[PDB]
Amino acid sequence: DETTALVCDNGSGLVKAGFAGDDAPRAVFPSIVGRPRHQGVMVGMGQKDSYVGDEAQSKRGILTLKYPIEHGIITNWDDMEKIWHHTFYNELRVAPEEHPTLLTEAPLNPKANREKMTQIMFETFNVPAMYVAIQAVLSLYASGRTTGIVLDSGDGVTHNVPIYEGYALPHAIMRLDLAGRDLTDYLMKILTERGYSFVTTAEREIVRDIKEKLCYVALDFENEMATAASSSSLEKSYELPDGQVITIGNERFRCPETLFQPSFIGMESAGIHETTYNSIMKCDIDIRKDLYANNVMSGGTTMYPGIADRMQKEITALAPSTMKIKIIAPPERKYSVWIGGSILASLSTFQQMWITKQEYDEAGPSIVHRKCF
């Protein structure tokens, strides 16, 4: 009885799912639940009271966009259940009671989150078996490596996990709540300097698209600020969905710099380079050599052009001058975690590490804290 196990990377801002053994996610759509707010006047078109991610993307102008997952933790459980039901039935058209499912999670997430996730996916969808895997180990699986620090930076969380030859160092795991959504909010707040006002949720997503299509990270900040406010070479234009053209100057690269300077939002934490260096310096010396030599990336918010060069420069400035820093920036930073999950779920030696229905029924939901990580 051959049954491919589903791999459902339900990230913080995008849901990436598919079957195990493929090379790319079958379905990719934002994790948004939309509800209309105005009053319906045409008799008959007042029945669809909830639009899942892509449909709610198509109809931004007459409804409100709410993200069920805020900064990693699942806030609204009903919306997340709706998203899971949609991605199981209306998107893959595969009954979830005949396929095992794999789910991902941030490292330092609360425990009630896992307990409720297991309860929902065992009682509602009646999945035969499920598993919860940290995203960094899946990123390392997908990178085809066994050593190095994973810098997984989605739009809800940014965490480092040092691994050496398969043995994780759980006392060096660092997690930051600064991610892509906060970059989008800073871009919204910094675009007002030129007069563009974005307040609604649809305008917030327009700003998100602007960030994806225009923003980049510079090597040096003072030099690039001088260049921007010394000419018009860095200015680029964007077209809003009503044909209105906007122009962006030094705001192009001052949006993603807050990753290295989180004092712009007012956070007391340090940049991603500093957290990576501190996580290395929480590990053993023999570990430290290979952690220096094998930095790896993942997550969407690390796709800014020029991120690798600057973080290499910063680590080299921080690390001792005689060591070799080599930062891996594969062109699949997006959904590398899903590729790793698909590799992991296709292993025949993984068949014994599921969470069978009998186990959950006999020992209760607490076994998700025992069989994971």
Binding site: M42, G44, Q47, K48, Y89, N90, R93, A95
Partner: protein
């Protein structure tokens, strides 16, 4: 020989037992079974010239308790009931296509004509000659049958003081969607192909009909030669009968002209051409519409403006509106459908007028009706057929419950209190006024920016909690309705194109002023005889209501027909085919009406080994059940002690079986 004419008397009623009884009787060369009021017939594929005129005197009503179950007993039963209760009634012939319904109709007409010793003298009353003609006009090839009745044929035989008068024929539930659309591996009505095959040359050079294989109304099936058994000889015999009916050559020529006009209208295309502010429509080739105009005695510009422009006409002005491509296609399809329906009505009216009987006379009804259909994929036509069969099954269930109630009262007075659950919820799910499925479809017809997906979503919303409705799990364009015959899954593909039967008044006004006399007369009569609606579903519902009213005017008693394996094998059949046909006919519901009851003397006799059961009981009313009930602590599931002891329940039967099996384990 093996009679088992009344299976009510057996120990238990199951579909397996009924199938075994029918198999045994069929192996005994017995076709008809007299299940109380109801009769069951099976197509034998065997030419049985049962007796002759003697069978009327041999199988009359005087010895129904000993006479073999036969189809012709109802002939005497009808007269016996009308001479006693002074009330005429109706007889329906129901069953799937190819189940010998036409053969049964011919046999019953022959028996009714032969019972009065007068048909030999007044055989000139020209009754059954046109049956093949109405067949060619009303039958078409289906994926499961090459001869399928697609209209509610109704023949009314009139009587006055025992004298058989003329007859009146009518149609009720013709499906107009077949003319313009047809599924795969099927085809249009047989007479179009018959005309194209038997077409004489003079029509070939005069009428442009050299594209008989490329007409859009005909090539939709994809293969029109599967019916190769039919040929131009059918056309020749149809013309012979057509001339027999007293029609002049002018009428036949006009009929062929209208059919050719319909076929030519089938081959008309439109182009999404630019205009002032939008892109609306434009006729591709004007030579075809010109040829249509030449052979219809009507202006060509009239057809152009009736299939391209929409006319909103008030008292002080008349405004022309450009139409979209889909609207133009819908208008053309409506024109073709109304032309075909008017032709059929005209021919039926003329046939009835030729042999019109006296008025205010007695009348017996014969109704040829659809059969329950469940294909691999189901469409709008199957939904309408299922709705009509649901109404008829409701009537049949009412009749069966009436028979059960009268039997119960005949036994003791106080069992009229027994209730019964009907299929009214299914009828409401289909066509209830506020939120019926057909009502939702009618609303979606006129609703702006509508598609199949929106209609499906609205049906899913309004009927989510209905137990009979069944939303598919996957996002599939289907839904499932629980009929009495089982679950049926329909497909919502192309419903909105099967209902836009909108005919504006300007088209009727254009066709009234036609130069030819027949078309003008037909449209004038249609306008004179004409509240209504403008969808195929609404007209179907109106016709169904008229048929139901006509049926309830009289007393319904009918007969079902079944079919063996469709490979035309005489005397051989599959029990699975019997189960399917039994489920589709609706006779299985009789078991549900039974909800069980057995004689108590039979229990006394054959249970002589139950705790050494004493057999010396000569009284059926003696206390024997409560004696075992209280001594053996049998739960008192029985509501009350009867006299005949027909209070048996299935739980008691199971308890008795359990007791029998446990006691038998002695050694």
């Amino acid at each position: 020989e093996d009679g088992v004419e009344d299976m009510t008397q057996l120990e238990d009623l199951q579909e397996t037992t009924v199938l075994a009884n029918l198999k045994t009787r069929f192996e005994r060369n017995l076709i008809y079974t007299y299940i109380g009021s109801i009769l069951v017939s099976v197509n034998p594929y065997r030419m049985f010239a049962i007796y002759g005129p003697e069978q009327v005197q041999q199988y009359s009503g005087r010895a129904l308790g000993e006479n073999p179950p036969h189809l012709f007993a109802i002939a005497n039963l009808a007269f016996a009931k009308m001479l006693d209760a002074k009330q005429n009634q109706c007889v329906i012939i129901s069953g799937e296509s190819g189940s010998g319904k036409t053969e049964a109709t011919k046999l019953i007409l022959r028996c009714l004509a032969a019972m009065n010793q007068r048909r030999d003298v007044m055989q000139q009353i020209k009754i059954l000659e046109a049956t093949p003609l109405l067949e060619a006009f009303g039958n078409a090839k289906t994926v499961r049958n090459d001869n399928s009745s697609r209209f509610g044929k109704f023949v009314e035989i009139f009587l006055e003081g025992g004298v058989i008068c003329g007859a009146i024929t009518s149609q009720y539930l013709l499906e107009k969607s077949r003319i313009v659309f047809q599924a795969k591996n099927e085809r249009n009505y047989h007479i179009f192909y018959e005309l194209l095959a038997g077409l004489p040359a003079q029509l070939r050079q005069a009428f442009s009909l050299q594209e008989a294989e490329t007409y859009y109304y005909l090539n939709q099936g994809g293969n029109c030669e599967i019916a190769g058994k039919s040929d131009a000889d059918d056309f020749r015999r149809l013309l012979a009968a057509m001339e027999v009916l007293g029609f002049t050559s002018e009428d036949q020529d006009s009929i062929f002209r209208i059919l050719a006009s319909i076929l030519h209208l089938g081959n008309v295309y439109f182009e999404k051409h630019e205009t002032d502010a939008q892109e609306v429509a434009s006729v591709v080739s004007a030579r075809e519409i010109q040829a249509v105009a030449e052979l219809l005695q009507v202006s060509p510009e009239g057809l152009q403006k009736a299939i391209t422009f929409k006319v909103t006409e008030t008292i002080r002005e008349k405004i022309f509106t450009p139409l979209t491509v889909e609207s133009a296609v819908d208008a053309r399809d409506a024109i073709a459908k109304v032309l075909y329906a008017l032709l059929f009505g005209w021919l039926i009216t003329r046939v009835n007028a030729l042999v019109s009987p006296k008025q205010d006379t007695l009348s017996i009804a014969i109704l040829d009706i659809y059969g329950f259909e469940d294909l691999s994929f189901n469409s709008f036509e199957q939904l309408c057929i299922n709705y009509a069969n649901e109404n008829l099954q409701y009537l049949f269930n009412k009749i069966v419950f009436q028979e059960e109630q009268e039997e119960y009262i005949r036994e003791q007075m106080d069992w009229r209190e027994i209730a019964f659950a009907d299929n009214q919820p299914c009828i409401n799910l289909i066509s209830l006024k506020p939120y019926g499925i057909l009502r939702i479809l009618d609303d979606q017809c006129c609703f702006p920016q509508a598609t199949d997906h929106t209609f499906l979503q609205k049906c899913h919303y309004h009927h989510g909690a209905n137990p009979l409705y069944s939303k598919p799990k996957m996002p599939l364009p289907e839904f499932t309705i629980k009929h009495y015959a089982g679950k049926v899954t329909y497909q919502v593909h192309k419903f909105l194109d099967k209902n836009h039967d909108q005919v504006r008044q300007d088209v009727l006004d254009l066709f009234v002023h036609s130069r030819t006399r027949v078309v003008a007369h037909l449209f004038s009569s249609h306008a004179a005889q004409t509240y209504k609606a403008h969808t195929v579903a609404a007209k179907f519902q109106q016709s169904l209501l008229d048929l139901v009213e006509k049926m309830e005017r009289c007393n319904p008693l009918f007969v079902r027909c079944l079919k063996p394996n469709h490979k035309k094998e005489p005397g051989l059949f599959e029990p699975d085919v019997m189960m399917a046909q039994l489920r589709y006919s609706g006779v299985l519901e009789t078991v549900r009406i039974r909800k069980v009851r057995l004689p108590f003397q039979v229990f006394i006799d054959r249970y002589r080994c139950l705790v050494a059961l004493k057999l010396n009981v000569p009284a059926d009313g003696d206390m024997c059940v409560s004696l075992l009930s209280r001594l053996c602590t049998v739960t008192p599931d029985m509501y009350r002690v009867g006299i005949s002891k027909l209070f048996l329940k299935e739980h008691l039967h199971q308890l008795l079986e359990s007791m029998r099996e446990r006691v038998q384990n002695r050694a």
